[PDB]
Design a protein around this ligand. Structure first.
Ligand SMILES: O=C(O)c1cc(C(=O)O)c2c(n1)C(=O)C(=O)c1cc(C(=O)O)[nH]c1-2
Ligand SMILES: O=C(O)c1cc(C(=O)O)c2c(n1)C(=O)C(=O)c1cc(C(=O)O)[nH]c1-2
Ligand SMILES: [Ca+2]
Ligand SMILES: [Ca+2]
Lengths: 571, 57, 571, 57
């Protein structure tokens, strides 16, 4: 709305989790730069009083900062004039059973802001709008039902007078849908499902008119056998992007359920799809399915980055996205034309490549999954070569700095029944480091890309997966947190590490920045968790537990322990 | 099954060698209980009803 | 043992919780001083992965640092060459019901070191010796039984080849005793009770020969009615001190049970007593009961500070101690002669004064407690004008920097039965700020004292009680953590604040210091809790809950949330 | 009761006006159960036994 736009245009503020409508997660603040970053030090810190994974980052509106924790999803408001005082807080009372239906740790990716309100959700499915000044509840509505395995973890997204919110739960057969509510009343405007009839999915009359080969009408049911689509996943729990001019919002729908591919023949549309929908009606103008008939749990909900760059000497409105499947996609955000589809790392073997003409991946049978067979050395693993991390883009050098994962796996499915409220996975995995690390043990990379060609400029290897993402600031710095507990800053030109600080626990969110009283500050949450930390968080030892993650991250507990809080830095 | 053989635009799925074209009646038949399959729809209906009475007040 | 002595004599090491055998909690390291302290910044941090109160402080032996958490009492070993790696860790498995019998949060005041071993206890009553280099368990024995309300919270104390350990639980009627175990085998050498026959109390033949008016034989039962001494309290959960030359260790026994004074007529010896005991036999050479017939829960377990200063023109071996009752005591540590007994603040009203000749407090009936009566405006409150904090002494200016509490109370007892394993308090309290604060709301003070006269030199007020204590370093600095989350450094000359840093959560332990590779570091635990934080920690709202502490500290939760970790600072 | 009147050295307790010199039989009689009073001693006996058994091996 107008209030959000005002904050967006206020220097030093941070009202949107991804950094803006285009989600480039960057900042023009340049007080801290290559020449003085070595003098950066901790300014102050704040503990949430909660453990488990602390994803996302705080919001800064004027003189106020809003911090959020992991389940039970507490909200704290601090006046930057005195970080030692909690002005108001909201501590939800939720049933502990909610945690049992959350697949990948009890995380929360953040708050949103609009019309003088803090838009906040709770794991148990409630969505609330709180007065930003007092914390008073203006409205509260139900969005997901934990009894059927549906929960909330992603950050809400505000555009104009609409709030976008999607439920999580594909691992429990939840049928995905992006729900739109009225920012002022919390009233349900519309709902666009990921599977089912064209009406339920909400396709405009000219859906994919520019690329009819992507598929158009009736596929929401035709690419499934029987009523399998009723529990076919497609949940969107990642991030959004929005283009004010076109009035289109973008996001990706998740993986189909169950993981057992043999139990659901068909392309399984429209799961694993990059969408371009009209904000007011929710009608899709175009949709590109990245991974037809998923066989590896490559949930396609990753960040959408909108940029305007020259394509063949011609300025073009683009959308770039690095999916779990290891492919970097760059499309025209107006019509959905596919421009780039390159492997982020040569280790990707599930596809020989993505044919730009057919618009589909050329599958390699050797690395497929199927009943009564154990697939081995499959890259990427289900954790993907990129997950929930939020990356940054530098407008000047036109470079995206991505936090990647270098993990592969062994995978074998098994038959199981569907029971509402119970997990519906059906697969046994084993995960381990990819093959290209310097010592073949590294599982993370910070890699700079050109979004128009899909080629890398430089690479920095990390012992553990770069789960949280990166932040880019005009001073020429790339900031990011590691699972082992460090906040680091790199020279954006060559990836040279210029500064670092050992926080109390690993970070799984992306850093943010803001200014207060003329001083630039860098903020990062800390407190390891999420899928990578399930072993540590729940004391699991079975290497196959945590859906295969436990074995891969067995060493994490020798570098960090749980935590929950925020650390701020400055000159 | 390389994903390049489409029956119609947007539908290129193919059964892998040795696997059925249709799983119903095969050993891979999920035999989903129609009652369970409709629980999400029922849950949403009841939920939307509750939200409506909130906005009403 | 000799190994400990070696570490004690090694510059830059910190092998003893209280700073040394004399427990002066100070350091000769002067790299950081009044002139450059403003440049001190956070060096690195470490989260324990546990919440609740984090008391005590880490130990540093050689290149190794040992960190401990609150219940379940985890131990972490870090090599200072790389704080990002946990060399070894011990994570105890304890029944959760252990927490139900701990009166004042599930805290742990620290580890001990001796004979190349990390001496560590668990809340459930177990005491262990672990190889300092590998974490291997050498021996493990039982010391306390939670089934009868006995638990462990204090730091063990090592002297020669003996480990001193005392159980907690006076609030549950546990009969106190100091237990001695063999450092190498864990075998019980002896046990000295606080009440009962002279045999069980272990009194020497010449006990109090220099001050027979203190009382000598048969008083452990004679000053009680019937067998009331069996559940008479007297637990020692504070700190010890040791004089190698005299081979005497010192400590104070706790409060008598129950809090209802009418249920236990008599002086109730030997609770509330300052002891001078022989390390090898445990036989008491002298004992001074500070508070006969306690009526206010002034558990006399506070720190004992040994210093050598000129008294009446002659160098004298002294022992100083600031009790919960608000009196600063200084005695000759050789014979127990009383030298100084002054009020730490004029607000103390339970006693008009302490008579040096009779050696007893001159009680003021207006502020006594008794059945069928509600005493009001009693100072100090049960939390005392000084609690478990560890203070520091500057040998040059001969000044003790005390962290005090300024809290008073209303009190009314009630009859109740004794049931092993159940609480045995019997009093309802209301606590609030003392009357002397600048705005009459302050509950904390850092006050410098001359131990030979008991007079104050300067005072710095704090909003909340100075629960953790202070550290003094030769650079002329007084370091301390506050309940609201700050680590601060004061000019030892006038108490002016020279530096501070906002940690994630309030600190309830005392700072420590050490050097590594020629650089001086200051370390402080963070994670609010203990008695002051019960309301915040257990979500209590009743003002009289938490033994009356909830009402007094109602605002604390608006300044900090729970946490658990360590922060290290340096130039 | 000011604490300055002692029957013998180290024993200066006095009943406050309105309270008995001995509570047994009075309305303030705690009437402690002998069995409950002895539980700590029995606990320590058992515990010392278990410890001795550990040291031996
Ligand atoms: O299908 C789903 O609805 C769903 C939900 C979530 C979530 O919201 O935490 C994750 C995933 N899938 C899973 O695919 C995944 O890789 C993942 C990682 C994390 C995390 O926070 O570290 N959440 C999720
Ligand atoms: O009588 C006892 O055994 C006992 C034990 C403890 C303890 O070990 O925590 C406390 C106390 N009493 C109580 O008197 C008290 O003031 C207190 C404060 C704290 C703390 O850690 O903040 N513990 C205790
Ligand atoms: Ca998923
Ligand atoms: Ca006590």
């Amino acid at each position: 709305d107008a209030d959000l736009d005002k904050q967006v245009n206020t220097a030093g503020a941070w009202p949107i989790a991804t950094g803006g409508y285009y989600s480039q997660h960057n900042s023009p603040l340049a007080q801290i730069n290559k020449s003085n970053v070595k003098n950066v030090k901790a300014a102050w810190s704040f503990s949430t009083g909660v453990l488990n994974g602390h994803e996302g980052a705080p919001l800064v509106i004027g003189d106020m900062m809003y911090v959020h924790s992991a389940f039970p999803n507490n909200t704290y408001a601090l006046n930057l004039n005195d970080p030692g005082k909690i002005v108001w807080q909201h501590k939800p009372k939720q049933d502990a059973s909610t945690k049992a239906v959350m697949c990948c740790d009890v995380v929360d990716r953040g708050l949103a802001y609009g019309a003088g309100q803090i838009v906040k959700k709770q794991a148990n499915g409630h969505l609330l709008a709180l007065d930003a000044k007092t914390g008073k509840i203006n409205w509260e509505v139900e969005v997901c039902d934990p009894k059927v395995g549906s929960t909330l973890t992603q950050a809400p997204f505000v555009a104009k007078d609409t709030v976008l919110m999607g439920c999580s739960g594909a691992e429990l057969g939840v049928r995905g849908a992006v729900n739109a509510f009225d920012l002022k009343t919390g009233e349900l405007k519309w709902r666009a499902f990921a599977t089912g009839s064209d009406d339920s999915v909400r396709l405009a009359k000219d859906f994919n008119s520019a690329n009819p080969h992507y598929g158009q009408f009736g596929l929401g049911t035709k690419t499934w056998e029987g009523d399998a689509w009723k529990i076919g996943g497609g949940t969107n729990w990642g991030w959004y992007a929005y283009d004010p001019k076109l009035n289109l919002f973008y996001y990706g729908s998740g993986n189909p359920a169950p993981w057992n591919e043999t139990m659901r023949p068909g392309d399984n549309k429209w799961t694993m799809t990059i969408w371009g929908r009209d904000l007011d009606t929710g009608m899709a103008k175009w949709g590109y399915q990245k991974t037809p008939h998923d066989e590896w749990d490559f949930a396609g909900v990753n960040q959408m980055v909108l940029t305007d760059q020259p394509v063949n000497g011609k300025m073009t409105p683009l959308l770039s996205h690095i999916d779990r499947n290891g492919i970097l996609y760059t499309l025209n955000r107006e019509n959905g034309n596919l421009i780039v589809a390159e492997k982020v790392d040569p280790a990707v073997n599930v596809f020989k490549k993505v044919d730009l003409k057919t618009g589909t991946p050329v599958r390699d049978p050797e690395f497929a999954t199927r009943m009564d067979h154990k697939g081995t050395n499959i890259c990427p693993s289900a954790m993907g070569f990129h997950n929930q991390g939020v990356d940054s883009y530098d407008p000047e050098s036109r470079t995206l700095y991505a936090g990647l994962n270098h993990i592969c796996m062994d995978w074998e499915p098994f038959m199981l029944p569907y029971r509402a409220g119970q997990f519906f996975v059906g697969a046994t995995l084993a995960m381990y480091p990819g093959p290209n690390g310097p010592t073949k043990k590294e599982m993370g990379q910070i890699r700079a890309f050109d979004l128009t060609t899909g080629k890398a400029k430089w690479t920095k290897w990390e012992k553990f997966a770069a789960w949280g993402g990166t932040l880019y600031t005009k001073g020429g710095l790339v900031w990011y947190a590691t699972l082992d507990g460090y906040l680091k800053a790199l020279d954006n030109k060559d990836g040279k590490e210029l500064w670092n600080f050992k926080m109390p626990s690993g970070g799984i969110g992306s850093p943010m920045t803001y200014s207060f009283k003329g001083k630039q500050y860098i903020g990062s949450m800390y407190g390891v968790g999420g899928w990578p930390g399930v072993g540590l968080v729940f004391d699991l030892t079975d290497p196959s537990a945590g859906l295969g993650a436990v074995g891969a991250f067995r060493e994490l507990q020798n570098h960090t322990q749980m935590g929950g809080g925020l650390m701020v830095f400055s000159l | 099954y390389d994903g390049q053989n489409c029956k119609e635009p947007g539908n290129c799925w193919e059964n892998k060698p040795g696997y059925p074209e249709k799983i119903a009646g095969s050993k891979y038949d999920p035999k989903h209980d129609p009652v369970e399959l409709n629980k999400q729809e029922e849950s949403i209906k009841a939920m939307d009803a509750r939200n409506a009475k909130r906005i009403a007040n």
